Amino acid sequence: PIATPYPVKEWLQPKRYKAHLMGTTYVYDFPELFRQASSSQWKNFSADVKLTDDFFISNELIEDENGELTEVEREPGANAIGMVAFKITVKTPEYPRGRQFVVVANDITFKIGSFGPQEDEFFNKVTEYARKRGIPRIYLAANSGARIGMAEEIVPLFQVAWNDAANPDKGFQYLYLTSEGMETLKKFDKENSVLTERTVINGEERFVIKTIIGSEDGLGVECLRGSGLIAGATSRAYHDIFTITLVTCRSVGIGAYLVRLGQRAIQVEGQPIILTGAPAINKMLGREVYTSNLQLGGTQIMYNNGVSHLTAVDDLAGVEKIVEWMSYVPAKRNMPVPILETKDTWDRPVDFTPTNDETYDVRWMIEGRETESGFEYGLFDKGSFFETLSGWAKGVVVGRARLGGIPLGVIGVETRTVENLIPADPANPNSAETLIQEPGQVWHPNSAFKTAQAINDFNNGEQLPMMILANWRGFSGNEVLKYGSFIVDALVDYKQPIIIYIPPTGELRGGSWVVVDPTINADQMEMYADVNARAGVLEPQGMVGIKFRREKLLDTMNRLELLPIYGQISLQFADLHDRSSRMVAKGVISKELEWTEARRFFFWRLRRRLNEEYLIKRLSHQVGEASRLEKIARIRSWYPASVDHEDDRQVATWIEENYKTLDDKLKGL
């Protein structure tokens, strides 16, 4: 393109053009996308904000002579390997003073962005660089999988010992190198390129090749080791720091695997996640079954199965989703979750309220609904709900949100009936589309798996508090059994305060309660039941049909048919047990709450709990053998004699008024 206003980027560095031709952004151009997403992040928080370019800094990372990652500034496209890294320090609304994180990405323009030993080592170095600093690791997937190849320096000068040179088609016995052939390697110093054994015949000597190694690195097994390295490295990363992946062009083999290992992933439409090549798959299936790779690792597949937590219209949308996601996570490991107050204060009732005589969307309780006559506020801050895994297991809703600025993970039950339509089966010209009916408030294999996943994803890396608006009436298909224990495990491992609240029209029966009972992890869990909720081992219908047969029905009968009415009286007699009042009496819940006052209660209870948890931790550096009970008990003995321990606002208030004073007490131990 001649005569253009300004210089042609795609000409100055053709690699940029190659990347675009691939349908993706040039690696070195991604940082600019983060500055834009970051800049937009401010505009949406406060339009009147004069932003200076020093609010976003990007510093590429390359290994020095000691293989140690260091910051440098060089011209794009100067990377010697197919892997690049950037250290980003940007000021955001959640962190005005600024925050940091790393970005690892494949250079799709460098050897089809394949994973070679040098690229793996680098990816591994970056990962631990982020883990060590407790910083989040963002990975941009755009690869072709593990690098492959043969010792090309042997394919031209390799000899074969046929059965008879006369009739070559008769077959052969082995391959070898001649005295000359062997000399050529010694000349290029590529002797190690092969293993042979001198053998003479009716002619001269014929060095029989027993094994080909090759002088080039990245032909086979060495690439498999590099993959395992980064695979296990990512696995550890996930339990250490915040990990997220964005599929920008395509992710193959180890690339697709890494997407799952990092767990949280956003897939850009059109960019497929391929484990094994489609063309190769048609070979292991016989006839041509698939046409394009999109039909395999497309968004309409990965996003629906839960592998892709989110999708993006394009790369910039992808970066924005990443940036928005991070707004809920701490600047770094072990750091207080990013507190962020907006126009929606904590002091206000909850407008939206579900009714037994009306279908509703759980989301309306979470963020709120917009009616024709105004906006009904929900339990959490307006527009603070960021849902994820929205294309899989619609039965349950998971997302981040804010409670008066306090970021937390939220899981709610979808009362509406889910209509999961499973596409036809390509590997079978007979089977077609299949519509599935996923009842509301009913646990399914995918629903339990999604719940466990959500819990772990909230706990690991994100380190956020959590609220589950428990509202399940049962389960059905054993996969439900297996994944079931996944949930209890995730809860035992939770390290932040948890809150289980059975919503108003909600209910919690049988094992649906067991899997989330506070006694699973009393150190972090508390359970509340709305005055309009219900809970019991069995639903009214099931109870009566067991402990209220017909003989007990007749005996009661004293109005002397009237079975229909007396029958309903049974259900009502039972229902009178599944009341929140009873829950309190039995002490199975911390207390019963009112939906409209919930927000005010939960905001202070959580703010108060976070304060004590902080203290319980600062105290976990004195006498080693100290029970958490003995810890919280000592800390509460520091409160003034007039402070009501049950008063959250007061307790939170005093503590925040004496952080240093309390610190001194700690230092004096």
Ligand X SMILES: C[C@@H](Oc1ccc(Oc2ncc(C(F)(F)F)cc2Cl)cc1)C(=O)O
Residue 572 vs residues 73, 417, 554, 565, 592: alpha-carbon distances, Å: 74, 26, 16, 11, 21
Structure tokens at 139: 């990975």
How far apart, in whole angstroms, are the C-alpha atoms of residue 323 and residue 38?
Answer: 7
Rounded distance between C-alpha atoms, residue 652 and residue 655, angstroms: 5
* Identified binder of ligand X from the candidate list 220, 510, 542, 567, rule CB under 6 A: 510
Does the annotation list 81 as a binding residue? no
- Of the residues 254, 326, 406, 418, which one makes contact with a copy of itself according to CB under 8 A: 254
Is 382 a residue that touches a copy of itself (CB under 8 A)?
Answer: no
List the interface residues with ligand X, window 171-230 (CB under 6 A). 224, 227
The number of helix segments (H) and strand segments (E) in the chain equals 23, 28
Q: Pick the stretch among 48-56, 131-139, 223-231, 603-611 that binds a copy of itself (CB under 8 A).
A: 223-231
355 binds, among ligand X, a copy of itself, none (CB under 5 to 8 A by kind): none
Q: Across the strands, what pairs with 311?
A: 267
In terms of CB distance, is 107 or 612 closer to ligand X? 107
574 binds a copy of itself (CB under 8 A): yes
Q: Residue 112: left if φ>0, alpha if ψ -120 to 50, beta else—which one?
A: left
Closest approach of ligand X to the CB of residue 285, in Å: 18
3-state secondary structure of 651: helix
Determine if 275 is a binding residue for ligand X (CB under 6 A).
Answer: yes
Structure tokens at 422: 């499973």
CB 501 within 8 A of CB 530: yes
- State both tokens at 648: 């959250």
Q: Which of 519, 494, 504 is nearest to 613 (CA)?
A: 494
Is 1 a binding residue for a copy of itself by CB under 8 A? The answer is no
Nearest-approach distance from CB 312 to ligand X, in angstroms? 22
Residue type, 47: A
CA 142 – CA 26 distance, rounded (Å): 10
Q: Is 534 annotated as a binding residue?
A: no
Closest CA to 442 of 394, 490, 372, 392: 394
One character per residue 465-484, x = contact with ligand X (rule: CB under 6 A): ----------x----xx--x
* CA 253 to each of CA 228, 248, 597, 623: distance values in angstroms, whole numbers, following the listed order: 12, 15, 51, 49
Least gap, CB of 412 to ligand X (angstroms): 15
CA 565/CA 568 separation, integer angstroms: 5
**Which of ligand X, a copy of itself, none does 448 bind, CB closer than 5 to 8 A by kind?**
ligand X
Q: Residue 302 is encoded by which pair of tokens? A: 């990965």
Closest to a copy of itself by CB, 62 vs 538, is: 538
Part in contact with a copy of itself (CB under 8 A); list of ranges 57-65, 183-191, 574-582, 654-662:
574-582
User: Which two tokens mark 416?
Assistant: 């509406």
| Interface pattern 136-175 for ligand X (x via CB under 6 A) | ---------xx-----------------------------
Distance from C-alpha of 3 to C-alpha of 10, rounded to nearest angstrom: 14
Q: With CB cut-offs between 5 and 8 Å by kind, which of a copy of itself, ligand X, none does residue 443 bind?
A: ligand X
Per CB under 8 A, which region of 23-31, 42-50, 90-98, 474-482 contacts a copy of itself? 474-482
Note the helical H segments in 241-333: 254-261, 278-283, 294-297, 299-305, 315-326
Q: How many residues bind a copy of itself (CB under 8 A)?
A: 107
- The residue among 270 and 542 lying less far from ligand X, judged by its C-beta, is 542
Task: Choose the binding region for a copy of itself from 41-49, 241-249, 339-347, 482-490 (rule: CB under 8 A).
Answer: 482-490
Q: Measured from the CB atom, is 222 or 613 closer to ligand X?
A: 222
CB of 618 to a copy of itself, least distance (A): 21
Is the Cβ of residue 254 or residue 319 nearer to a copy of itself in the bound state?
Answer: 254
Q: Which does 126 bind (CB under 5 to 8 A by kind): a copy of itself, ligand X, none?
A: none
The answer on whether 147 is annotated among ligand-binding residues is yes
- Contacts with ligand X in 20-59 (CB under 6 A)? none
Q: Per CB under 8 A, does 208 bind a copy of itself?
A: no
Question: Which residue's CB is nearer to ligand X, number 383 or number 511?
Answer: 511
Consult the annotation and say whether 436 binds a ligand.
no
C-beta closer to ligand X: residue 126 or 413: 413
Rounded Cα–Cα distance for residues 331 and 664 (Å): 26
Alpha carbons 26 and 18: distance in angstroms, whole number:
8
- Which two tokens mark 73? 């500034």
Comparing every residue's Cβ against ligand X, the nearest one is 253
- Of 351, 364, 339, 437, nearest to 394 by C-alpha is 437
Distance separating alpha carbons of residues 464 and 458, to the nearest angstrom: 6
**Smallest Cα–Cα separation from 317: which of 661, 660, 40, 608?**
40
Among 448, 466, 490, 499, binds ligand X (CB under 6 A): 448
Site string for a copy of itself, 146-175 (x = CB under 8 A): xxxxxx---xx-x-x----x--xx-xx--x
93 in contact with ligand X (CB under 6 A)? no
Residue whose entry in the numeric block shows the structure tokens 């002490």: 587
34 close to 90: Cβ distance less than 8 angstroms: yes
Report whether 634 belongs to an annotated binding site: no
Measured CA to CA, the distance from residue 213 to residue 617 in angstroms comes to 55
The answer to whether 396 contacts ligand X (rule: CB under 6 A) is: no
> Among 52-60, 511-519, 619-627, 642-650, which window interacts with ligand X (CB under 6 A)?
511-519
Q: What are the φ/ψ torsions at residue 495 (nearest 5 degrees)?
A: -115, -5
Q: Is 549 annotated as a binding residue?
A: yes
Q: Which is nearer to a copy of itself, 47 or 155 (CB)?
A: 155
Contact 607/411 with Cβ under 8 angstroms? no
Q: Which is nearer to a copy of itself, 249 or 274 (CB)?
A: 274
Is 392 a residue that touches a copy of itself (CB under 8 A)?
Answer: no
Compute the distance between CA of residue 614 and CA of residue 626 in angstroms, rounded to an integer.
16
* Residues composing the chain: 669
Q: Is 287 in the site for a copy of itself (CB under 8 A)?
A: no
* Of residues 583-602, those binding a copy of itself (CB under 8 A): 583, 585-586, 588
C-alpha–C-alpha distance, residues 412 and 471, integer Å: 7
Residues 227-246 that bind ligand X (CB under 6 A): 227
Q: Is 511 in the site for a copy of itself (CB under 8 A)?
A: yes
254 is a site residue for ligand X (CB under 6 A)? yes
Which of a copy of itself, ligand X, none does residue 12 bind (CB under 5 to 8 Å by kind)? Answer: none
Cα separation, 216 vs 220, in Å, equals 10
190 is in an annotated binding site: no
572 binds, among a copy of itself, ligand X, none (CB under 5 to 8 A by kind): a copy of itself
374-377 long-range CB contacts below 8 Å, 24 or more apart?
375/351, 376/351, 376/352, 377/344, 377/348, 377/349, 377/350, 377/351, 377/352
- Among ligand X, a copy of itself, none, the one that 291 touches (CB under a kind-dependent 5 to 8 A) is none
Report the alpha-carbon distance of residue 90 to residue 423 in Å, rounded: 43
Per the annotation, binding residues for CoA are 250, 547, 549
Per the annotation, binding residues are 146-148, 250, 511, 547, 549
> In the complex, which residues of this chain contact ligand X (CB under 6 A)?
145-146, 224, 227, 253-254, 257, 275, 443, 448, 475, 480-481, 484, 487, 510-512, 514-515, 537
Per the annotation, binding residues for acetyl-CoA are 146-148, 511
